[PDB]
């Protein structure tokens, strides 16, 4: 509350560390469905169904231009990529499996780096 603060957690390395995570996600062999924005002209249903499209290149540009206020808003966009993927893709598809794999990979790096 006013003039009453928990001890200051060191956040000065968060930008660097999110960038490293994102690099690891970008270079994973199962990243291919997520590297670029879904082409809304060429994929029927995507535009109407997925209210907030997100992809790794869009997260990279937001990261690089100071558009994440803190590490939690970064994690929310990463999770959005995988939540979108589950909305649009069957679990038993190459893309559906890719999204589960990447979500797992992300959540471990997130825990190991920050928790």
One Martini backbone bead per residue (centre of mass of N, CA, C, O) as a GRO file, in nm:
protein
  115
    1UNK     BB    1   0.105   0.028  -0.004
    2UNK     BB    2   0.144   0.334   0.108
    3UNK     BB    3   0.474   0.310   0.196
    4UNK     BB    4   0.438  -0.025   0.122
    5UNK     BB    5   0.700  -0.257   0.041
    6UNK     BB    6   0.820  -0.499  -0.105
    7UNK     BB    7   1.090  -0.636  -0.203
    8UNK     BB    8   1.315  -0.578  -0.476
    9UNK     BB    9   1.294  -0.746  -0.757
   10UNK     BB   10   1.516  -0.837  -1.007
   11UNK     BB   11   1.450  -0.693  -1.351
   12UNK     BB   12   1.713  -0.614  -1.543
   13UNK     BB   13   1.722  -0.918  -1.705
   14UNK     BB   14   1.449  -0.982  -1.846
   15UNK     BB   15   1.489  -0.897  -2.146
   16UNK     BB   16   1.726  -1.096  -2.202
   17UNK     BB   17   1.583  -1.356  -2.115
   18UNK     BB   18   1.338  -1.347  -2.308
   19UNK     BB   19   1.516  -1.347  -2.563
   20UNK     BB   20   1.642  -1.628  -2.515
   21UNK     BB   21   1.387  -1.788  -2.516
   22UNK     BB   22   1.285  -1.700  -2.793
   23UNK     BB   23   1.528  -1.819  -2.944
   24UNK     BB   24   1.464  -2.118  -2.864
   25UNK     BB   25   1.185  -2.119  -2.999
   26UNK     BB   26   1.277  -2.038  -3.295
   27UNK     BB   27   1.488  -2.309  -3.309
   28UNK     BB   28   1.281  -2.509  -3.301
   29UNK     BB   29   1.161  -2.762  -3.501
   30UNK     BB   30   0.837  -2.688  -3.405
   31UNK     BB   31   0.800  -2.369  -3.495
   32UNK     BB   32   0.684  -2.332  -3.791
   33UNK     BB   33   0.369  -2.250  -3.721
   34UNK     BB   34   0.492  -1.966  -3.541
   35UNK     BB   35   0.689  -1.756  -3.694
   36UNK     BB   36   0.432  -1.648  -3.843
   37UNK     BB   37   0.168  -1.509  -3.956
   38UNK     BB   38  -0.128  -1.580  -4.034
   39UNK     BB   39  -0.296  -1.602  -4.340
   40UNK     BB   40  -0.598  -1.436  -4.367
   41UNK     BB   41  -0.643  -1.484  -4.679
   42UNK     BB   42  -0.556  -1.820  -4.680
   43UNK     BB   43  -0.733  -1.888  -4.397
   44UNK     BB   44  -1.004  -2.020  -4.327
   45UNK     BB   45  -1.155  -1.878  -4.023
   46UNK     BB   46  -0.929  -1.723  -3.866
   47UNK     BB   47  -1.027  -1.431  -3.836
   48UNK     BB   48  -1.305  -1.500  -3.683
   49UNK     BB   49  -1.203  -1.696  -3.452
   50UNK     BB   50  -0.922  -1.531  -3.398
   51UNK     BB   51  -0.903  -1.252  -3.210
   52UNK     BB   52  -0.572  -1.297  -3.125
   53UNK     BB   53  -0.316  -1.293  -3.297
   54UNK     BB   54  -0.004  -1.492  -3.273
   55UNK     BB   55   0.365  -1.470  -3.295
   56UNK     BB   56   0.707  -1.473  -3.287
   57UNK     BB   57   0.761  -1.213  -3.467
   58UNK     BB   58   0.572  -1.026  -3.297
   59UNK     BB   59   0.714  -1.066  -3.029
   60UNK     BB   60   0.994  -0.970  -3.122
   61UNK     BB   61   0.906  -0.679  -3.196
   62UNK     BB   62   0.790  -0.601  -2.920
   63UNK     BB   63   1.048  -0.651  -2.756
   64UNK     BB   64   1.241  -0.458  -2.934
   65UNK     BB   65   1.008  -0.191  -2.871
   66UNK     BB   66   0.885  -0.175  -2.572
   67UNK     BB   67   0.580  -0.352  -2.546
   68UNK     BB   68   0.677  -0.475  -2.268
   69UNK     BB   69   0.631  -0.403  -1.934
   70UNK     BB   70   0.660  -0.721  -1.860
   71UNK     BB   71   0.709  -1.059  -1.824
   72UNK     BB   72   0.394  -1.131  -1.823
   73UNK     BB   73   0.319  -1.017  -2.102
   74UNK     BB   74   0.502  -1.212  -2.254
   75UNK     BB   75   0.373  -1.482  -2.162
   76UNK     BB   76   0.089  -1.427  -2.273
   77UNK     BB   77   0.172  -1.428  -2.577
   78UNK     BB   78   0.288  -1.708  -2.588
   79UNK     BB   79   0.029  -1.858  -2.493
   80UNK     BB   80  -0.154  -1.751  -2.722
   81UNK     BB   81  -0.031  -1.921  -2.943
   82UNK     BB   82  -0.123  -2.202  -2.810
   83UNK     BB   83  -0.427  -2.134  -2.777
   84UNK     BB   84  -0.480  -2.089  -3.079
   85UNK     BB   85  -0.391  -2.368  -3.176
   86UNK     BB   86  -0.606  -2.531  -3.014
   87UNK     BB   87  -0.860  -2.393  -3.144
   88UNK     BB   88  -0.772  -2.481  -3.471
   89UNK     BB   89  -0.641  -2.769  -3.377
   90UNK     BB   90  -0.585  -3.076  -3.374
   91UNK     BB   91  -0.412  -3.286  -3.168
   92UNK     BB   92  -0.410  -3.497  -3.429
   93UNK     BB   93  -0.164  -3.312  -3.552
   94UNK     BB   94   0.108  -3.155  -3.635
   95UNK     BB   95   0.033  -2.876  -3.514
   96UNK     BB   96  -0.092  -2.970  -3.246
   97UNK     BB   97   0.170  -3.106  -3.142
   98UNK     BB   98   0.353  -2.866  -3.164
   99UNK     BB   99   0.206  -2.691  -2.948
  100UNK     BB  100   0.245  -2.876  -2.712
  101UNK     BB  101   0.556  -2.892  -2.720
  102UNK     BB  102   0.611  -2.578  -2.696
  103UNK     BB  103   0.473  -2.529  -2.428
  104UNK     BB  104   0.648  -2.717  -2.262
  105UNK     BB  105   0.922  -2.582  -2.330
  106UNK     BB  106   0.847  -2.303  -2.220
  107UNK     BB  107   0.762  -2.369  -1.919
  108UNK     BB  108   1.039  -2.471  -1.832
  109UNK     BB  109   1.207  -2.214  -1.897
  110UNK     BB  110   1.043  -2.030  -1.711
  111UNK     BB  111   1.090  -2.174  -1.442
  112UNK     BB  112   1.410  -2.194  -1.461
  113UNK     BB  113   1.455  -1.871  -1.485
  114UNK     BB  114   1.212  -1.745  -1.255
  115UNK     BB  115   1.127  -1.997  -1.010
   0.00000   0.00000   0.00000
